[PDB]
Amino acid sequence: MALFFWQHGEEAMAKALVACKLCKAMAHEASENDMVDDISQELNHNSRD
Amino acid sequence: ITDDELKKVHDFEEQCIEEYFREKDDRFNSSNDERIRVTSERVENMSMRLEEVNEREHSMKASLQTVDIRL
Amino acid sequence: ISRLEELYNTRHGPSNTLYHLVRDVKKREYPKGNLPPDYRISLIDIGLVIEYLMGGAYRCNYTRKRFRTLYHNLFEINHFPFPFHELMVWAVLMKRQKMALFFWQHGEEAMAKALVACKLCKAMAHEASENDMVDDISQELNHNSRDFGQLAVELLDQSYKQDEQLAMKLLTYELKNWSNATCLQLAVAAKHRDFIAHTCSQMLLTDMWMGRLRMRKNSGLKVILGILLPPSILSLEFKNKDDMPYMTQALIPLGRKIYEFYNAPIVKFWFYTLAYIGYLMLFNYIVLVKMERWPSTQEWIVISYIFTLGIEKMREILMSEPGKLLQKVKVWLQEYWNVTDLIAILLFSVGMILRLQDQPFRSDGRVIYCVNIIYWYIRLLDIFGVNKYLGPYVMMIGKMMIDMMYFVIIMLVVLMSFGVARQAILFPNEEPSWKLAKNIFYMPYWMIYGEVFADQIDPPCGQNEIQLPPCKTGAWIVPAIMACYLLVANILLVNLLIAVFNNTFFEVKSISNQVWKFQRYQLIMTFHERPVLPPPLIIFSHMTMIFQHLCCRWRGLKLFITDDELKKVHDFEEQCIEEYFREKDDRFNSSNDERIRVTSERVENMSMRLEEVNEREHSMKASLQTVDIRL
Amino acid sequence: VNKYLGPYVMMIGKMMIDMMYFVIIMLVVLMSFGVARQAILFPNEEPSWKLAKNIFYMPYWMIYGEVFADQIDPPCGQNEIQLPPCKTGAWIVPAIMACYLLVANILLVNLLIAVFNNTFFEVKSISNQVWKFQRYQL
Ligand SMILES: CC(C)CCC[C@@H](C)[C@H]1CC[C@H]2[C@@H]3CC=C4C[C@@H](OC(=O)CCC(=O)O)CC[C@]4(C)[C@H]3CC[C@]12C
Ligand SMILES: CC(C)CCC[C@@H](C)[C@H]1CC[C@H]2[C@@H]3CC=C4C[C@@H](OC(=O)CCC(=O)O)CC[C@]4(C)[C@H]3CC[C@]12C
Ligand SMILES: CC(C)CCC[C@@H](C)[C@H]1CC[C@H]2[C@@H]3CC=C4C[C@@H](OC(=O)CCC(=O)O)CC[C@]4(C)[C@H]3CC[C@]12C
Ligand SMILES: CC(C)CCC[C@@H](C)[C@H]1CC[C@H]2[C@@H]3CC=C4C[C@@H](OC(=O)CCC(=O)O)CC[C@]4(C)[C@H]3CC[C@]12C
Ligand SMILES: CC(C)CCC[C@@H](C)[C@H]1CC[C@H]2[C@@H]3CC=C4C[C@@H](OC(=O)CCC(=O)O)CC[C@]4(C)[C@H]3CC[C@]12C
Ligand SMILES: CC(C)CCC[C@@H](C)[C@H]1CC[C@H]2[C@@H]3CC=C4C[C@@H](OC(=O)CCC(=O)O)CC[C@]4(C)[C@H]3CC[C@]12C
Ligand SMILES: CC(C)CCC[C@@H](C)[C@H]1CC[C@H]2[C@@H]3CC=C4C[C@@H](OC(=O)CCC(=O)O)CC[C@]4(C)[C@H]3CC[C@]12C
Ligand SMILES: CC(C)CCC[C@@H](C)[C@H]1CC[C@H]2[C@@H]3CC=C4C[C@@H](OC(=O)CCC(=O)O)CC[C@]4(C)[C@H]3CC[C@]12C
Ligand SMILES: CC(C)CCC[C@@H](C)[C@H]1CC[C@H]2[C@@H]3CC=C4C[C@@H](OC(=O)CCC(=O)O)CC[C@]4(C)[C@H]3CC[C@]12C
Ligand SMILES: CC(C)CCC[C@@H](C)[C@H]1CC[C@H]2[C@@H]3CC=C4C[C@@H](OC(=O)CCC(=O)O)CC[C@]4(C)[C@H]3CC[C@]12C
Ligand SMILES: CC(C)CCC[C@@H](C)[C@H]1CC[C@H]2[C@@H]3CC=C4C[C@@H](OC(=O)CCC(=O)O)CC[C@]4(C)[C@H]3CC[C@]12C
Ligand SMILES: CCC1(c2ccccc2)C(=O)NCNC1=O
User: Fold this and answer.
1) With CB atoms 3.0 to 4.6 Å apart as the test, which of C5, C148, C556, D90 could cross-link to C117 if both were Cys?
2) Cβ pair C104, C113 in contact under 8 A
3) Ligand 7: which of C425, C452, C457, C458 to mutate, judged by most atoms within 8 Å of the beta carbon?
4) CB C446 to CB D67 under 8 A?
5) Which of C526, C503, C273, C517 is nearest to C392 (CA)?
6) What span, in angstroms and rounded, lies between the C-alpha atoms of C608 and C176?
7) What does residue D82 show for φ and ψ, rounded to 5 degrees?
């Protein structure tokens, strides 16, 4: 859904960089709060995408 | 930058998004794996339509032989 | 039973090494010898064969008293409840790989069957290499072991993909048809390194490590703060009462919190580590400071540590897997650290007995203490082996010693040649004395490490400065051969060992990572079975257990799941097998090679049918032309 | 700020973490040889803080080409001026010296050479990207 919404609308570069920041931040927060490690890996993958 | 240049960079960003998406589509359509898959499938269908063509050609040959026998 | 005995006694099909295994277990059981040619191999002997190959405390269902009673009374009671299991074992034993792979797909408990097959294949490969058979048989058996291991790894991947918790239940549940074992225990008994180093089993081992503590964030430090400060335990977050209870045998909240904390294996390990570090500094204090006639309080604490640790090592020997004590010792000798610990305990006992006497034996006991202090420092590498960076480093050093040994041998040859040449030129009138070997080995060995002994390279002699003693004949060869020795030592051999250590780095690093991830299980289950109290206070837990044993005489961390959950894990295991097989079929059908081949063929046929179509179209065109000419 | 020296400093920064484990194993082996040598060669010492200095002093300089050749195997228990008598078990002091000098100078340093070389390429690429990243911060 995020990749679909990235295509539509303006300011796609800032939207992509903000999404990469948010994904890395929630990956770090999920690793810090002792959640499932697969969630942190998938959030890091979304940040890299 | 101003509203005018904002409109310009928004147009630039949309051209960049369309060019990137359809260049990815061109790369995917020209890869060896997708070409082999599309071919394989196309070939699969061909044979099936040509087997139908062979059966209908046998029927047409039998009809032509019967018409030649009648006349 | 009779049909399976006839299957085990067949002579058709490919060759096998089963007869050698039956001969070896018959020679071991009744020390006879070679079997008669007309020998009918009973399934009891197959049971002993399975027990010998699987090793440890494995007890095949054939050798149990129920099956021997059924055998004595008969040679649906004679029908096997799980026939695919015995068929699988039959196939794996007589080296029919495709039949075993077919029987792996059909039936339940496919994971335990695959791990047992990998164990059996590796064991017969080792036995075929030991008995000097054909090496191709050993290679093919190792290939079959690796194929069954890859099957189990892919099944584990599918179980982790579908549902996590029921996959843990698959990994932990007791296998009644496999000597009451566990899939994890079978993956460790078969030395399956890829199975244990998988991320699911690693986090299972991490969950097993932490006991009943949630924690998992900056771990180790809060464990140490709980150890050193007993009122720091109540601030730690504790897991639920029923969230993952791995056990072996299936006010008050404060006492439950204390009991759950102090029985956690990480807390028990850090207890043992702090007690060990305290013992090491108490050993340092008694060896640096002078020793009186009687031992001090610190020496008494060190002696108490050594002897309680010795009784604890004897406890690890007695509470082991086999039933016969020689096999218990043979199992315990696999861990080399335990053997060197026992040797160090005996050496400290000899040193203490020599120290408690008078001179000149007290100094000898002090010296034996000073040699033991070296090993008790070196044991900190195994203590640090629990770390995810230091453990593989220690394993890597272990691999690198074997590469160093050949350098040591070539080094010894060149060093001994230069030592013999220098001592035999510069000293031409010596007498038979043991100082000649010391003069051979002394100077060249320190020549390696930056000390060339510059005062004695080419000393000025045969001149008056005080008159120097005359020159020994041929002494000028002593510098020149020195030059050669210093080159081959310092620029050739050390640089070659640098290249050896660097080129064997990557493979040894990956193997050290997998072996550390494998022996994490061994660390966890050894430290779960250990008593709560540290080694200096372990005598209390030991008398406690001795009194409990006497009271009982007067009167694997599994899950022990039920028939219902057994049905659930069997359904899960069948979904995993079907998903893995048809995902392999999807991968094979979507590969480029198979698509190109299927196309090529389809095209081949097309042309042939279209050539027939062209000929029939020519015939139809001729018929239409004739019909148009007629009308 | 330089395009050659900056990644070199970042690379040294990465290499310190690889050095730390060598330092730990080095500390264990060095402390064992220091305790053994001080506790054999000095059997009548008193509680004093010089014992730790004698533990840490000689083995650490033994790593860097100074084996202290005058004090490896000093001649004693003989008349030359009469030398003081031999300490008991002093012949173990050279032999364990041999082992310590091997594991220090041919095993551990060569292993750290291999560690630094095998982690060179990835750390070099990461140092290049981190330098190019922190150019903005500069
Ligand atoms: C679990 C680990 C990380 C910490 C626990 C170990 C320390 C608390 C121990 C180990 C060595 C001990 C020392 C060993 C020897 C001595 C000499 C001892 O002095 C004497 O016996 C003579 C002088 C006097 O009686 O005061 C005083 C205690 C002290 C410093 C000890 C203090 C406590 C130490 C530091
Ligand atoms: C279990 C061990 C390995 C680690 C935990 C540390 C403490 C529980 C122990 C170990 C060393 C012990 C010390 C060793 C030596 C001494 C010297 C001792 O001094 C005397 O006995 C001198 C006076 C006299 O002669 O009566 C007093 C106890 C003390 C400080 C001990 C206090 C308790 C310590 C710190
Ligand atoms: C103070 C002087 C005498 C120097 C002491 C040198 C040796 C007594 C030490 C130094 C480094 C040690 C090695 C460091 C690493 C390892 C790997 C480790 O091996 C394993 O973990 C595999 C064995 C197993 O656990 O089954 C322990 C043995 C070994 C070779 C050690 C053997 C003893 C060594 C050679
Ligand atoms: C990598 C390979 C080639 C290493 C091989 C070296 C060792 C076999 C040599 C090198 C230095 C030798 C030691 C040098 C000096 C001594 C002291 C010597 O002590 C005595 O003779 C007692 C009286 C005295 O000290 O004068 C006993 C032999 C020993 C330990 C030697 C034993 C053999 C050693 C360890
Ligand atoms: C070929 C390589 C692999 C090994 C070479 C080993 C040498 C270093 C050994 C083997 C024979 C040894 C000799 C065999 C016999 C003796 C007599 C022995 O005489 C005594 O002990 C007499 C009483 C005394 O003075 O103690 C002194 C050592 C010596 C010269 C040995 C010195 C060391 C030698 C030359
Ligand atoms: C694979 C490598 C590491 C094996 C190396 C083995 C040998 C090279 C070592 C092991 C035992 C050593 C011996 C142990 C004890 C002695 C007694 C020592 O005797 C003296 O020094 C006599 C007193 C004196 O006059 O100094 C001479 C060296 C020698 C033969 C050593 C020579 C070197 C030896 C044969
Ligand atoms: C890797 C390359 C660069 C090595 C080249 C080094 C050699 C060519 C040199 C280094 C040390 C030299 C030796 C140093 C000392 C002497 C003793 C010297 O003896 C005498 O003059 C006899 C009387 C006396 O000893 O005073 C004869 C030459 C020689 C063997 C030299 C020969 C040439 C050597 C072997
Ligand atoms: C004169 C004697 C006391 C020797 C001095 C040794 C140390 C004080 C120096 C020598 C090399 C230095 C290191 C060289 C390179 C780096 C990388 C550099 O790290 C970074 O750029 C990352 C940190 C950041 O900027 O966020 C600065 C720290 C460090 C580890 C340095 C830390 C301090 C070290 C160990
Ligand atoms: C890679 C790892 C294993 C390195 C570990 C080595 C250090 C922990 C050691 C090695 C040399 C030691 C030093 C050697 C000598 C001294 C002088 C000493 O000074 C005094 O005692 C003052 C009076 C005097 O100088 O006599 C104080 C300790 C110190 C700095 C020592 C502190 C600890 C050091 C730095
Ligand atoms: C196990 C490894 C990781 C660490 C080992 C550390 C040792 C090198 C330490 C720990 C205990 C220390 C001892 C603890 C107590 C004392 C008493 C202390 O006595 C005094 O200070 C008395 C007054 C004076 O003479 O200054 C002298 C140092 C000493 C022997 C310490 C020397 C250094 C020791 C052996
Ligand atoms: C990861 C690595 C680098 C950590 C290394 C830490 C220790 C090995 C160092 C850090 C602080 C050092 C201590 C700092 C100061 C001293 C006092 C010093 O005291 C004296 O020399 C007393 C005066 C004299 O009689 O010489 C003895 C060494 C010692 C204990 C040092 C021993 C080595 C220590 C414990
Ligand atoms: C002596 C070392 C140790 C130990 C401690 C921590 C980790 C591993 C081993 C112990 O203190 N007692 C039981 N077993 C042992 O060998």
Assistant:
1) C148
2) yes
3) C458
4) yes
5) C517
6) 60
7) -90, 125
Residues in chain A with CB shorter than 8 Å from the CB of B14 are 10
Calculate the CA dihedral of residues C565, C207, C320, C392 and round it to 10 degrees: 130
Rounded distance between C-alpha atoms, residue D30 and residue D52, angstroms: 12
Question: CA nearest A38: which of C200, C473, D66, C604?
Answer: C200
Instruction: Output DSSP code: residue C161.
Output: H
The H or E element that residue C411 is part of is helix C390-426
The amino acid at residue C73 is N
Position C415: which residue type?
Answer: L
Of B43, B47, B61, the CB nearest to C619: B61
Nearest CA distance, D83 vs chain C (angstrom): 19
Per the DSSP assignment, residues forming a β-bridge with D82 are D79
What 8-state DSSP symbol labels residue C238?
B
The answer to whether the CB atoms of C616 and B61 lie below 8 A apart is yes
Alpha-carbon distance B26 to B31, whole Å? Answer: 9
From the number of C-beta atoms within 10 Å of its C-beta (0-12, 13-18, 19+), residue C526 rates as: middle
Scanning the structure block, which residue is given the tokens 């406690």?
Answer: C544
Tokens of C403: 């590469």
Q: Give me B64's structure tokens.
A: 């032509």
Site to substitute for ligand 2 among C276, C284, C297, C306, most atoms within 8 A of C-beta: C297
- For residue C464, count other CB atoms closer than 10 A to its CB: 6
Whether the Cβ atoms of residue C455 and residue C421 lie closer than 8 Å to each other: no
C506 in reach of chain D (CB within 8 A)? yes
Beta carbons within 8 Å of D72's beta carbon, 6+ residues apart: C446, D94, D97
In angstroms, the CA C250 to CA D110 distance is 52
Structure tokens at C136: 């191709």
**Gapped junctions in chain B, after residues (C–N > 2.5 Å):** none
Dmax (CA) for chain B in angstroms is: 89
Resolution attained, angstroms: 2.9
User: Between chain A and chain B, how many beta carbons pairs sit less than 8 Å apart?
Assistant: 11
**One-letter amino acid of C534:** P
Reference C175, options C570, C449, C480; nearest CA is C570
CA C4 to centroid of chain Cα atoms: 35
Closest residue, chain D, to C446 (C-alpha): D67
State how far residue C575 is from chain B, nearest Cα, in angstroms: 29
Calpha distance C401→C405 (Å, rounded)? 6
Strand partners, C199: none
Residue B55 touches partner C, C-beta closer than 8 Å: no
Contacts 24+ apart (CB under 8 A), B43-49: B43/C599, B43/C602, B43/C603, B43/C606, B44/C602, B46/C602, B46/C606, B47/C602, B47/C605, B47/C606, B47/C609
Q: Please state, in angstroms and rounded to a whole number, the distance separating the CA atoms of residues D116 and D19.
A: 9
CB-based contact, A11 to chain C, within 8 Å: no
Indicate if ligand 1 lies below 6 Å from the C-beta of C228. no
- Dig out the tokens for D110 from the structure: 């060569």
Nearest ligand, CA of residue D48? 10
- Peptide linkage before C360 cis (omega within 30 of 0): yes
CB atoms under 10 Å from CB of C484, counted, come to 12
Spatial contact of C253 and C266, defined as CB atoms under 8 Å apart:
no
Enumerate residues 6+ apart whose C-beta is below 8 A from C255.
none
- CA distance readout (Å), C582 to C20, C587, C589: 39, 9, 10
Cβ–Cβ < 8 Å for C613, B57: yes
Give me D2's structure tokens.
Answer: 């330089």
Q: How far apart are CA D98 and CA D104, in angstroms?
A: 10
Neighbours of C93 (CB within 10 A): 22
∠C331-C333-C338 over CA atoms, to 5°? 120
